[PDB]
């Protein structure tokens, strides 16, 4: 996501009823939801398939395959969360509980099995199809939606955009009534910013590849983007040598910026790279949409969430139903 990005969004957002999604293609990035903290994960993921299907979209869902990792924090975070798991799985051997060194064992490795496949499979017991990106799932879903093989995206990840894509619904998730449908045209058109602004900002604000100038929000962002045109990463180059003769040795926004602290490699031009020249298959090829299997769904959920046929088919019932109508 991006800190306040979504704010200098706001006004291109558009309210639409769920209902307005029937019989659109669109990409969900699943990957997101895997990588952040019984089995409470499946419990959502179950919720959210019977939500998408109740409403007769075609999901296609998006896994990363080797998906870069390049802020320094979630590379100590990343890096501090893998090597917990051995400390307490070496000691959980030396006790002797095994079915706890299986739990510390999946986190170890650089994407976990378990969830991985488990989600794979309930997506098979729904009929959902999904794919693996070569590398950032969200970039392959921009260009799933530049290349008209879907009618946009799902997501709250505003990093969507620096990707280049072009139709985004959010919210879709939550318990409000209308969920928010955004188009590049339009805050193209409304703010003038394009892809290459939006990195910029991106730079400024912080996003999943950088941690973004310390306290600086949408109000100083864009008043650095203000204060240095040029095109491409220029504003930023020249906000940058501003900033260092600024302290070797008098507006309000001047004083301001002279406090920030930059990093010395900054701006460092291979976060834009990986923005605009991702590692993607535009490739056509229709994807194919199954139905949900419902003796294999009641099974599922008795395993994991520990659901009677009864419970299970409170869930399951509806979204049937909603699949012959229409």
Same mark, same amino acid.
């Given at each position: 996501?991006?800190?306040?990005?979504?704010?200098?969004?706001?006004?291109?957002?558009?309210?639409?009823?769920?209902?307005?999604?029937?019989?659109?293609?669109?990409?969900?990035?699943?990957?997101?939801?895997?990588?952040?903290?019984?089995?409470?994960?499946?419990?959502?993921?179950?919720?959210?398939?019977?939500?998408?299907?109740?409403?007769?979209? +075609?999901?296609?869902?998006?896994?990363?395959?080797?998906?870069?990792?390049?802020?320094?924090?979630?590379?100590?975070?990343? +890096?501090?969360?893998?090597?917990?798991?051995?400390?307490?799985?070496?000691?959980?051997?030396?006790?002797?509980?095994?079915?706890?060194?299986?739990?510390?064992?999946? +986190?170890?490795?650089?994407?976990?099995?378990?969830?991985?496949?488990?989600?794979?499979?309930?997506?098979?017991?729904?009929?959902?199809?999904?794919?693996?990106?070569?590398?950032?799932?969200?970039?392959?879903?921009?260009?799933?939606?530049?290349?008209?093989?879907?009618?946009?995206?799902?997501?709250?990840?505003?990093?969507?955009?620096?990707?280049?894509?072009?139709?985004?619904?959010?919210?879709?998730?939550?318990?409000?009534?209308?969920?928010?449908?955004?188009?590049?045209?339009?805050?193209?058109?409304?703010?003038?910013?394009? +892809?290459?602004?939006?990195?910029?900002?991106?730079?400024?604000?912080?996003?999943?590849?950088?941690?973004?100038?310390?306290?600086?929000?949408?109000?100083?962002?864009?008043?650095?983007?203000?204060?240095?045109?040029?095109?491409?990463?220029?504003?930023?180059?020249?906000?940058?040598?501003?900033?260092?003769?600024?302290?070797?040795?008098?507006?309000?926004?001047?004083?301001?910026?002279?406090?920030?602290?930059?990093?010395?490699?900054?701006?460092?031009?291979?976060?834009?790279?990986?923005?605009?020249?991702?590692?993607?298959?535009?490739?056509?090829?229709?994807?194919?949409?199954?139905?949900?299997?419902?003796?294999?769904?009641?099974?599922?959920?008795?395993?994991?969430?520990?659901?009677?046929?009864?419970?299970?088919?409170?869930?399951?019932?509806?979204?049937?139903?909603?699949?012959?109508?229409?």
């Amino acid at each position: 996501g991006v800190q306040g990005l979504w704010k200098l969004l706001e006004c291109s957002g558009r309210q639409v009823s769920p209902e307005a999604l029937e019989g659109k293609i669109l990409a969900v990035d699943i990957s997101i939801w895997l990588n952040q903290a019984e089995n409470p994960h499946l419990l959502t993921l179950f919720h959210r398939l019977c939500k998408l299907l109740f409403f007769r979209i +075609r999901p296609i869902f998006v896994f990363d395959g080797d998906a870069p990792l390049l802020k320094k924090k979630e590379l100590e975070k990343r +890096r501090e969360a893998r090597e917990e798991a051995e400390e307490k799985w070496r000691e959980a051997l030396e006790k002797g509980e095994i079915e706890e060194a299986r739990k510390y064992a999946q +986190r170890a490795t650089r994407v976990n099995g378990q969830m991985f496949l488990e989600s794979q499979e309930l997506l098979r017991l729904f009929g959902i199809p999904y794919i693996q990106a070569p590398m950032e799932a969200e970039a392959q879903c921009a260009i799933l939606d530049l290349t008209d093989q879907t009618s946009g995206t799902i997501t709250d990840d505003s990093d969507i955009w620096l990707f280049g894509a072009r139709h985004v619904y959010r919210n879709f998730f939550n318990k409000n009534k209308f969920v928010e449908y955004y188009q590049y045209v339009d805050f193209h058109n409304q703010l003038g910013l394009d +892809r290459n602004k939006l990195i910029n900002l991106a730079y400024l604000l912080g996003s999943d590849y950088t941690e973004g100038i310390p306290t600086v929000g949408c109000v100083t962002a864009m008043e650095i983007l203000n204060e240095f045109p040029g095109h491409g990463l220029e504003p930023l180059l020249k906000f940058s040598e501003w900033w260092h003769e600024a302290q070797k040795n008098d507006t309000k926004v001047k004083k301001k910026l002279r406090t920030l602290q930059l990093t010395p490699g900054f701006p460092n031009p291979a976060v834009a790279e990986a923005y605009l020249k991702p590692v993607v298959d535009d490739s056509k090829g229709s994807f194919l949409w199954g139905k949900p299997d419902l003796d294999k769904i009641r099974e599922f959920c008795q395993r994991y969430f520990g659901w009677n046929r009864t419970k299970t088919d409170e869930s399951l019932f509806p979204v049937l139903k909603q699949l012959d109508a229409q």
